[PDB]
Symmetry: C5
Subunit: 273 residues, 5 copies
């Protein structure tokens, strides 16, 4: 039960973080494979059943838990507003990647474009996820083999046709950076009372990537009762995903690309019962 806002000196605090994209090649530090950090490997229809995608072809949600100043009818940190920005947008004007497919003979490269997916979330606990897939017959790498967490992971059995729709048993929590595939998991609207999430998709193969950036834009995190996400155990949960389109390679091969996201969250102290 939520009570009055705490009045006093150090009642407001400001938290900063950035999250690097987890597109498939999720580390910049690996000796050899890390050239493709912020990218997938080449995305291709197999041409025969079943699909058996590799983890490098499975862009995943970014998530971080931020520890907040210790507080203790108790006081909890309440997230009230956030400034967030996708970073490195200007990098996408580059149309002279050495192995870029040209728009036509002697032309510039096809710029990063096509499929976009953009979401962020701010919550006082992990984001609630609902599982739904394009094709239930997809064989995702097993979690026990080092793969991501998918619907088969949570069910403890194979997906059935119902997982192409909304199966209420196909649920999870976003508690692991770079391990929950975007194509498997979306925000669960039946839950997430203590989170605020905002997202969009854009399909098409060469659809223009259209993005804005400004340090003047603020998202208010209060619900219709004037209450923001309340941070359980002094943890603020921050999640996102920013697919910005394909890198088109000379051969015809295509890899998805992501960008990092920055957050500045304002929190206040709130009495709870």
């Amino acid at each position: 039960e939520v009570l009055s806002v705490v009045t006093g000196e150090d009642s407001i605090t400001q938290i900063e973080l950035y999250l690097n994209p987890r597109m498939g090649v999720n580390s910049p530090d690996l000796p050899t494979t890390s050239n493709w950090y912020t990218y997938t490997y080449d995305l291709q229809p197999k041409g025969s059943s079943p699909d058996q995608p590799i983890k490098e072809n499975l862009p995943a949600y970014s998530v971080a838990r931020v520890s907040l100043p210790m507080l203790n009818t108790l006081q909890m940190w309440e997230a009230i507003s956030v400034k967030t920005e996708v970073v490195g947008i200007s990098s996408l004007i580059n149309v002279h990647y050495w192995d870029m497919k040209r728009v036509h003979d002697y032309g510039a490269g096809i710029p990063v474009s096509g499929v976009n997916y953009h979401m962020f979330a701010i919550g006082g606990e992990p984001l609630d996820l609902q599982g739904l897939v394009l094709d239930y017959q997809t064989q995702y790498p097993k979690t026990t083999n080092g793969g991501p967490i998918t619907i088969e992971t949570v069910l403890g059995r194979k997906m059935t046709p119902k997982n192409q729709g909304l199966d209420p048993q196909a649920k999870a929590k976003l508690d692991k950076d770079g391990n929950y595939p975007i194509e498997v998991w979306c925000p669960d609207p039946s839950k997430n009372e203590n989170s605020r999430y905002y997202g969009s998709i854009q399909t098409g193969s060469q659809t223009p990537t259209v993005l804005q950036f400004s340090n003047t834009l603020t998202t208010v995190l209060l619900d219709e009762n004037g209450v923001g996400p309340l941070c359980k155990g002094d943890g603020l949960f921050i999640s996102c995903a920013d697919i910005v389109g394909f890198l088109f390679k000379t051969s015809g091969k295509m890899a998805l690309h992501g960008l990092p996201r920055y957050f500045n969250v304002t929190l206040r102290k709130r009495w709870v019962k």
Copy 2:
């Protein structure tokens, strides 16, 4: 049905929650060996000769549910005042590696789900009123099966059914049985429902969709009165076609996503 004052008291407000799975043509996930295409149509392909005889698996239909509300009884009725609604599984559409997906060019990714979209929802205190109108009146719809204009008139369609025929009316009272291409919301009725919809045409038109748990639709009309649930029944209807799945052969199927609803209702005195 004269509307009196809003009821005051302890248990005067309730919230109703549900989800509706899409009824694209393959409507059940529980079938021997046809359910692999659940949430899809079969292949949509102009025959090249008349007449068109579309199969039921090629007719996306409206989803509908009647939610039973806590029994109440000048009487009290539940009044829907607002709704949070969301299209679920939007993220599933970043998949450009379906095993049998047509590629955008040699060695490239699959053409993503794109093209024709159609998105509507309705919240009402009775079944949504429907108006019949078809692209081609000479279309031979299967008999009962889906309910079409021929079904309701008990005679064949004539050219007037390419426009607005006042006799071509139905009530959306059955899940997965009223084809989208045949029926639309009747704006001449639906006093006790609220509906919101759009269409997008084109073959590879980008599917552009938003999702947020911060967005609320107010269901009150200009007199501050929401839909009043007759017989303690709330009717929820929707359709969400999100584009085509492009197969290697060149064939194409339409695809749909489920929709979630959270409706807030209050008690209302009525005479």
Copy 3:
């Protein structure tokens, strides 16, 4: 005519409902011979030689009705204050399996109704004022029968009719008779009407349309006065071209949808 106060009394507000079927070129559903193409044009093609001599079936025209209002009679006039309007049958445009539909690629679905859109509606207390302007003044329109610039001028068009010629004026007083490609609302007149319209060109441009029974248009001008119905007549006009039907041969016909109106009117004193 001087506008006085709004009339007060029990029966001073009234509501008017109607629908207008589209007049695309084949304008009747009742012709045993040709009505299959009702709500469509015939095939649209450049002749390849001069001059263009378009047939009436290829000239979409404005829809119009005069609604008779209750007789009131310094006297009282009906004042249109708001309107709920909706394009009907939007959902029909998801059909991508018309038997003679041009496939998007080999073995694919049909090219959806798409391309050129033109959408307008008007509410007035007298016929809409029309201004004539054409793409090509050398066009030989069928004699009256559609009413064109030649009809009103009593002589051949000249180059000036490719721009604004103040002599090229008409009243929208007949359903299905004034070609959209010749006539547009006249902004220099129409003080007793409200009109709202748009165009979309391109050949395969997505048709993007919305429908809701919650959207109202306010018809009051900046002085709080709506159209006043001369002789107790309410004039409702519209046009809704929704794109091309792409046929297997390559041929293309423009298509239209009907429109619904619910207009609220109040009594007003005038001198």
Copy 4:
């Protein structure tokens, strides 16, 4: 020029109506006049230099309106406070059967007027201040006969006229003489004008335009002051390029539409 109080009295408001026909290159209908409201064929040579013809240089429309004379160090001036403006003849663009139109494909309709759009209007109490900037400084425009950067400089352009050169300035004082591709509004001046404009580039980009007689633009600045009409002259300027006419041969010509204005003015004391 010190602005005092608004004049109050019986006859202190006036309305100015006018229309401006487009000046796309063929600027008169009273001759060649078949192509009035169009350019000639726009076509990169493939070799240098470009020496465009005047018929290929769409220009700004302008009119000075003589206002009722009003009149001391302190006198009355007309102040433009608002305007209704509308692009006329938008409906004419539904024509996809110009006799010489390039087809979208074999047997199909003509490619609709579409592609490059440029739309701007301006209301001022003096001529619109113009800034010169060209795509290519090596372009050799015709001598006076349109007014260009060379005309005002009295010498040939240099590379800097591809950017902002502060010497490349002019006033929009003559209808049909200032090329759009050479001149844009000068944001460093124009204190006594309001202007509003947009561009859209591309070859077949949909032309998307709206029209309504219910839309007003307020001309008051941040201090509640509209343009003040020096010597009782109101200056009205525009351009409305609506896309290409696509010809069978592959040749392409730009097309313009006229614009209507209704300007409301009030009397204002000035020192």
Copy 5:
């Protein structure tokens, strides 16, 4: 650093006007042999082999100016506070030209493909240099090493080679936008983790022939006050103005393509503010 009251009395408000010409790669109009390409890049092309070694002329960069403000002046001082700006991309109308002699025709005998494709638009008003964050499409790109202070890239500020982490957010890859036409747009974006004393506003549009859609109007004002009602405060009596306005490609007959940019105009209103 503590903001007190707005100053009152005559002449507390001043206005600053300027324009910034674009720096697309060919940055001067005064070099007789190459200045024909002023406001354009050279031809943009994927090399076909590793590594990319891009030339300066192919690196559109930010425009920046530092405007000197009137002197005003102790613990309590007056500073200029930028409160609003009218800004406009100039020469938008020039883009209707589809008959450039070497313009690629849209189809046989047709008009030229108009300037279109990749747009990038941003402007900033600040009381100090804009803070930059470095991030590149490909970390293996070998940007030019020069001796004349430009182009400045990630390697320049690190004093060592980029690693894979420079395809993401590397907190060490930071700089200040302190020199006109020297900081490449494809390397640097505004740093949202700083810039407390600047306001910035920007967008991108990708695709190759995507319509260039721009507006212009002298009635458009951008308010520069933060949520506390405080605009950028000009330290050293210096107002920093930055922008970039890439408006698309020039499609040449050969198939070759160059990016093009337009200048930007600014009218900034400032007021005197007491500070501690």
